[PDB]
Coordinates of C-alpha atoms in Angstrom, one line a residue:
Chain A
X1 CA -26.6 54.9 14.9
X2 CA -27.7 51.2 15.5
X3 CA -30.7 52.8 17.2
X4 CA -32.2 53.4 13.7
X5 CA -32.6 49.8 12.5
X6 CA -33.8 48.8 16.0
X7 CA -36.4 51.6 15.8
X8 CA -37.4 50.7 12.2
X9 CA -37.7 47.0 13.3
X10 CA -39.9 47.8 16.3
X11 CA -42.1 50.1 14.4
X12 CA -42.5 47.4 11.7
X13 CA -43.4 44.8 14.3
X14 CA -46.1 47.0 15.9
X15 CA -47.3 47.7 12.3
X16 CA -47.7 43.9 11.7
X17 CA -49.7 43.5 14.9
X18 CA -52.0 46.4 14.0
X19 CA -52.7 44.7 10.7
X20 CA -53.2 41.3 12.3
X21 CA -55.7 42.9 14.7
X22 CA -57.6 44.3 11.7
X23 CA -57.6 40.8 10.1
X24 CA -58.8 39.2 13.3
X25 CA -61.8 41.6 13.6
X26 CA -62.8 40.6 10.0
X27 CA -62.5 36.9 10.7
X28 CA -64.5 37.2 14.0
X29 CA -67.1 39.0 12.0
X30 CA -67.3 36.0 9.6
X31 CA -67.6 33.5 12.4
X32 CA -70.4 35.7 13.9
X33 CA -72.1 35.9 10.5
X34 CA -72.2 32.1 10.1
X35 CA -73.7 31.7 13.5
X36 CA -76.9 33.0 11.8
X37 CA -78.1 29.5 11.1
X38 CA -79.9 30.1 14.4
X39 CA -81.9 33.2 15.6
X40 CA -85.4 34.7 15.3
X41 CA -87.3 37.6 16.9
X42 CA -86.0 39.3 20.0
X43 CA -82.8 37.2 20.1
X44 CA -82.1 38.1 16.5
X45 CA -83.0 41.7 17.5
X46 CA -80.5 41.3 20.3
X47 CA -78.1 39.8 17.8
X48 CA -78.6 42.5 15.2
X49 CA -78.2 45.2 17.8
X50 CA -75.0 43.5 19.1
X51 CA -73.8 43.2 15.5
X52 CA -74.4 46.8 14.6
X53 CA -72.5 47.8 17.7
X54 CA -69.6 45.5 16.9
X55 CA -69.4 47.0 13.4
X56 CA -69.5 50.5 14.9
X57 CA -66.7 49.8 17.4
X58 CA -64.5 48.2 14.7
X59 CA -64.6 51.4 12.7
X60 CA -63.4 53.1 15.9
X61 CA -60.5 50.5 16.4
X62 CA -59.5 50.8 12.7
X63 CA -59.6 54.6 13.0
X64 CA -57.3 54.3 16.1
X65 CA -54.8 52.0 14.4
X66 CA -54.6 54.4 11.4
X67 CA -53.4 57.0 14.0
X68 CA -50.8 54.5 15.6
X69 CA -49.5 53.4 12.1
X70 CA -48.7 57.0 11.3
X71 CA -47.0 57.6 14.7
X72 CA -45.2 54.3 15.5
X73 CA -46.3 51.6 13.0
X74 CA -46.0 50.8 9.3
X75 CA -46.0 54.4 8.0
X76 CA -43.7 55.6 10.8
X77 CA -41.1 52.9 10.1
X78 CA -41.3 53.4 6.4
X79 CA -40.7 57.2 6.9
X80 CA -37.7 56.6 9.1
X81 CA -36.2 54.0 6.6
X82 CA -36.5 56.3 3.6
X83 CA -35.3 59.3 5.7
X84 CA -32.2 57.3 6.7
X85 CA -31.6 56.6 2.9
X86 CA -31.9 60.3 2.1
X87 CA -29.4 61.1 4.9
Chain B
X1 CA -87.4 16.0 18.6
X2 CA -86.4 19.7 18.7
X3 CA -84.3 21.3 15.9
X4 CA -82.1 22.7 18.7
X5 CA -81.3 19.2 19.9
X6 CA -80.6 18.1 16.3
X7 CA -77.9 20.8 15.6
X8 CA -76.5 20.8 19.1
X9 CA -73.0 19.5 18.3
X10 CA -72.3 22.0 15.6
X11 CA -73.9 24.9 17.5
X12 CA -71.8 24.1 20.5
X13 CA -68.6 23.8 18.3
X14 CA -69.6 27.2 16.8
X15 CA -69.9 28.7 20.3
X16 CA -66.4 27.4 21.0
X17 CA -65.2 29.1 17.9
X18 CA -66.8 32.5 18.5
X19 CA -65.4 32.5 22.1
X20 CA -61.9 31.7 20.7
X21 CA -62.2 35.1 18.9
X22 CA -63.0 36.9 22.1
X23 CA -59.7 35.6 23.5
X24 CA -57.7 36.5 20.4
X25 CA -59.1 40.0 20.3
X26 CA -58.3 40.6 24.0
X27 CA -54.8 39.2 23.6
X28 CA -53.9 41.1 20.4
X29 CA -55.3 44.3 21.9
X30 CA -53.3 43.9 25.1
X31 CA -50.1 43.4 23.1
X32 CA -50.7 46.3 20.9
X33 CA -51.2 48.4 24.1
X34 CA -48.0 47.1 25.7
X35 CA -46.0 47.7 22.4
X36 CA -47.5 51.2 22.0
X37 CA -46.2 51.9 25.5
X38 CA -42.8 50.4 24.8
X39 CA -42.6 52.8 21.8
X40 CA -43.8 55.9 23.6
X41 CA -40.8 58.2 22.9
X42 CA -41.2 57.5 19.1
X43 CA -44.7 59.1 19.3
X44 CA -45.0 62.8 18.4
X45 CA -48.0 65.2 18.3
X46 CA -48.7 64.3 14.7
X47 CA -52.5 63.9 14.8
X48 CA -52.3 66.2 17.9
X49 CA -53.2 63.0 19.9
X50 CA -50.7 62.3 22.7
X51 CA -49.5 58.7 23.3
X52 CA -51.2 58.8 26.7
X53 CA -54.5 59.8 25.1
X54 CA -54.2 57.0 22.5
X55 CA -53.3 54.3 25.1
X56 CA -56.5 55.2 27.0
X57 CA -58.7 55.3 23.9
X58 CA -57.2 52.1 22.7
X59 CA -58.0 50.1 25.9
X60 CA -61.5 51.6 26.0
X61 CA -62.2 50.7 22.4
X62 CA -60.8 47.2 22.8
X63 CA -62.8 46.6 26.0
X64 CA -65.9 47.7 24.0
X65 CA -65.1 45.6 20.9
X66 CA -64.8 42.4 23.0
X67 CA -68.0 43.0 24.9
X68 CA -69.9 43.8 21.7
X69 CA -68.5 40.5 20.3
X70 CA -69.3 38.6 23.5
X71 CA -72.9 39.8 23.4
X72 CA -73.3 38.1 20.1
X73 CA -71.5 34.9 21.4
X74 CA -74.0 34.8 24.3
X75 CA -77.0 35.3 22.0
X76 CA -75.8 32.1 20.2
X77 CA -75.1 30.1 23.4
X78 CA -78.7 31.0 24.6
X79 CA -80.0 28.9 21.8
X80 CA -77.5 26.0 22.1
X81 CA -78.7 25.6 25.8
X82 CA -82.3 26.7 25.1
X83 CA -82.8 23.1 24.0
Chain C
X1 CA -71.9 41.3 1.5
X2 CA -70.1 38.4 3.2
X3 CA -67.4 39.2 0.5
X4 CA -66.5 42.3 2.5
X5 CA -65.1 40.6 5.6
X6 CA -63.1 38.3 3.3
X7 CA -61.6 41.3 1.4
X8 CA -60.8 43.2 4.6
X9 CA -59.2 40.1 6.0
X10 CA -57.2 39.4 2.8
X11 CA -55.9 43.0 2.7
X12 CA -55.1 43.2 6.4
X13 CA -53.0 40.0 6.0
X14 CA -51.2 41.5 3.0
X15 CA -50.6 44.5 5.2
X16 CA -49.1 42.4 7.9
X17 CA -46.6 40.8 5.5
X18 CA -45.7 44.2 4.1
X19 CA -44.8 45.3 7.7
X20 CA -43.0 42.0 8.2
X21 CA -40.8 42.6 5.2
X22 CA -39.9 46.1 6.5
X23 CA -39.0 44.3 9.8
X24 CA -36.9 41.6 8.0
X25 CA -35.0 44.4 6.1
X26 CA -34.3 46.1 9.4
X27 CA -33.1 42.9 11.2
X28 CA -30.9 42.2 8.1
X29 CA -29.4 45.7 8.5
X30 CA -28.5 45.1 12.1
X31 CA -26.8 41.9 11.3
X32 CA -24.9 43.7 8.5
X33 CA -23.7 46.7 10.7
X34 CA -22.5 44.2 13.4
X35 CA -20.2 42.5 10.8
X36 CA -18.4 45.5 9.1
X37 CA -15.9 46.0 12.0
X38 CA -13.8 43.0 11.0
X39 CA -12.6 44.3 7.5
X40 CA -10.1 46.9 6.4
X41 CA -9.4 49.0 3.2
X42 CA -10.4 47.2 0.0
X43 CA -12.5 44.5 1.6
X44 CA -14.2 47.1 3.8
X45 CA -14.8 49.6 0.9
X46 CA -16.5 46.8 -1.0
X47 CA -18.7 46.1 2.1
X48 CA -19.5 49.8 2.6
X49 CA -20.4 50.1 -1.1
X50 CA -22.6 47.0 -0.8
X51 CA -24.1 48.5 2.3
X52 CA -24.9 52.0 0.9
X53 CA -26.6 50.2 -2.1
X54 CA -28.6 48.0 0.3
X55 CA -29.7 51.0 2.3
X56 CA -30.8 52.7 -1.0
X57 CA -32.8 49.8 -2.3
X58 CA -34.6 49.3 1.1
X59 CA -35.8 52.9 0.7
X60 CA -37.3 52.0 -2.7
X61 CA -38.8 48.8 -1.5
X62 CA -40.3 50.7 1.4
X63 CA -41.6 53.3 -1.0
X64 CA -43.1 50.4 -3.0
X65 CA -44.7 48.8 0.0
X66 CA -46.2 52.2 0.8
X67 CA -48.0 52.0 -2.5
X68 CA -49.2 48.4 -2.0
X69 CA -50.6 49.3 1.4
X70 CA -52.8 52.1 0.0
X71 CA -54.2 49.8 -2.8
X72 CA -54.5 46.3 -1.3
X73 CA -53.0 46.4 2.2
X74 CA -53.3 47.9 5.7
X75 CA -54.8 51.2 4.6
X76 CA -57.1 49.7 1.9
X77 CA -58.5 47.3 4.5
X78 CA -59.1 50.1 7.0
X79 CA -61.0 52.1 4.4
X80 CA -63.2 49.2 3.5
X81 CA -63.9 48.5 7.2
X82 CA -64.7 52.1 8.1
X83 CA -66.7 52.6 4.8
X84 CA -68.7 49.4 5.6
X85 CA -69.6 50.8 9.0
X86 CA -70.7 54.2 7.7
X87 CA -72.9 52.6 5.1
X88 CA -74.3 50.0 7.6
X89 CA -75.5 52.5 10.2
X90 CA -76.8 55.1 7.7
Chain D
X1 CA -11.3 35.8 15.1
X2 CA -12.3 33.2 12.5
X3 CA -15.4 31.8 14.4
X4 CA -16.9 35.2 15.3
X5 CA -16.6 36.2 11.6
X6 CA -17.9 32.9 10.3
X7 CA -20.8 33.0 12.7
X8 CA -21.7 36.5 11.3
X9 CA -21.4 35.1 7.8
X10 CA -24.0 32.4 8.6
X11 CA -26.1 35.0 10.4
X12 CA -26.3 37.1 7.3
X13 CA -27.1 34.1 5.0
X14 CA -30.2 33.6 7.1
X15 CA -31.4 37.0 6.1
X16 CA -30.6 36.6 2.4
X17 CA -32.9 33.6 2.3
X18 CA -35.4 35.4 4.5
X19 CA -35.5 38.6 2.3
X20 CA -36.1 36.5 -0.9
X21 CA -38.8 34.2 0.6
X22 CA -41.0 37.0 1.9
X23 CA -40.5 39.1 -1.2
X24 CA -41.6 36.2 -3.3
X25 CA -44.5 35.7 -0.9
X26 CA -45.5 39.3 -1.3
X27 CA -45.2 39.1 -5.0
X28 CA -47.6 36.2 -5.1
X29 CA -50.1 37.8 -2.7
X30 CA -50.2 41.1 -4.7
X31 CA -51.0 39.1 -7.8
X32 CA -53.7 37.1 -5.9
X33 CA -55.2 40.5 -5.0
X34 CA -55.0 42.0 -8.5
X35 CA -58.8 42.5 -8.7
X36 CA -58.8 44.7 -5.6
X37 CA -56.1 47.0 -7.2
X38 CA -56.8 50.4 -8.8
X39 CA -54.6 53.4 -9.8
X40 CA -54.5 55.1 -6.4
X41 CA -51.2 56.9 -6.8
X42 CA -51.8 56.1 -10.5
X43 CA -49.6 53.0 -10.6
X44 CA -51.1 49.9 -12.1
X45 CA -50.9 46.4 -10.5
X46 CA -48.8 45.1 -13.4
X47 CA -46.4 48.1 -13.1
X48 CA -46.1 47.4 -9.4
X49 CA -45.6 43.6 -9.9
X50 CA -42.7 44.3 -12.3
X51 CA -41.2 47.0 -10.2
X52 CA -41.5 44.9 -7.0
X53 CA -39.8 41.9 -8.5
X54 CA -37.0 44.0 -10.0
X55 CA -36.4 45.8 -6.7
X56 CA -36.5 42.6 -4.7
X57 CA -33.7 41.1 -6.9
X58 CA -31.4 44.1 -6.4
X59 CA -32.0 44.2 -2.7
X60 CA -31.2 40.6 -2.1
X61 CA -28.1 40.9 -4.4
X62 CA -26.9 44.0 -2.5
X63 CA -27.2 42.0 0.7
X64 CA -25.6 38.8 -0.6
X65 CA -22.7 41.0 -1.8
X66 CA -22.1 41.9 1.8
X67 CA -22.4 38.3 3.0
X68 CA -20.0 37.0 0.3
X69 CA -17.5 39.8 0.7
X70 CA -17.6 39.1 4.4
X71 CA -17.2 35.4 3.7
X72 CA -14.4 35.7 1.1
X73 CA -12.6 38.1 3.4
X74 CA -12.7 35.9 6.5
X75 CA -11.3 32.9 4.6
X76 CA -8.3 35.1 3.8
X77 CA -7.9 36.0 7.5
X78 CA -7.6 32.3 8.8
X79 CA -5.1 31.5 6.0
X80 CA -3.0 34.5 7.1

């Protein structure tokens, strides 16, 4: 009844947060990229290693948010909204 | 002279900025986790992944993202104070 | 190269606003439902007709946001992020 | 009563303004990201821009129709 809009709203809000998370990872990546007026040798090696890892884990986090968006996020709320229109 | 002493103010400011992103990533991740819990009963076996399984994988991945990011931050600070 | 994080960011931000529209539509609907009660007959029928129309167009706008998302939004950004990671390690 | 109703009217007018503002903002952002757009479904960015704007007008007009009908009705109640 009134549950439906409240569900749609909440699923949208989670969906916005998932997207802001994604945006934040990218921004963080750009801040890290510009810190590269700095390193050389084994600290750059440590930095490159740490970077490669951070890229790797991001892909993981984006993969996980794809799953959540389908279940309770932006896709989920879109589905419910259109479903309520159909019915 | 030192070139590390010459750029100290900006390298420090830049450390401050990177660390700001550690905090933002932690916070946004915690919210996402709380909200995913709040919405548990809306979650179905769509992927075949339960909500409990996702919660756990989310927190694990987030803890790993922040540490990976903090490793880079530390690599920077090491120069700023190498001086 | 550094263009990639900018793109991912730009798209994720678009994806957020898409979700925030869906949220605004939903909050507008709650405010609409809670203000039907008052009316009766002709004034009500006009409201219900205006409501059924609004619920229809939200569906279309949601369908339209779904397209935006895949092209320049939440999903697009995810693909660029994940694609950047697979190319980076390989 | 008149206040409960008139409060709800003002509540709805908030959302009319909100729906418009963000839709326009979305319109602008989709244009700004035109170069990142391809025919995924098969829909061009121009097609989407036009369809988006058109659909944002009818959505806000649907909603304002509720707010107005609610507003015009309530004024009739207090005069009764």
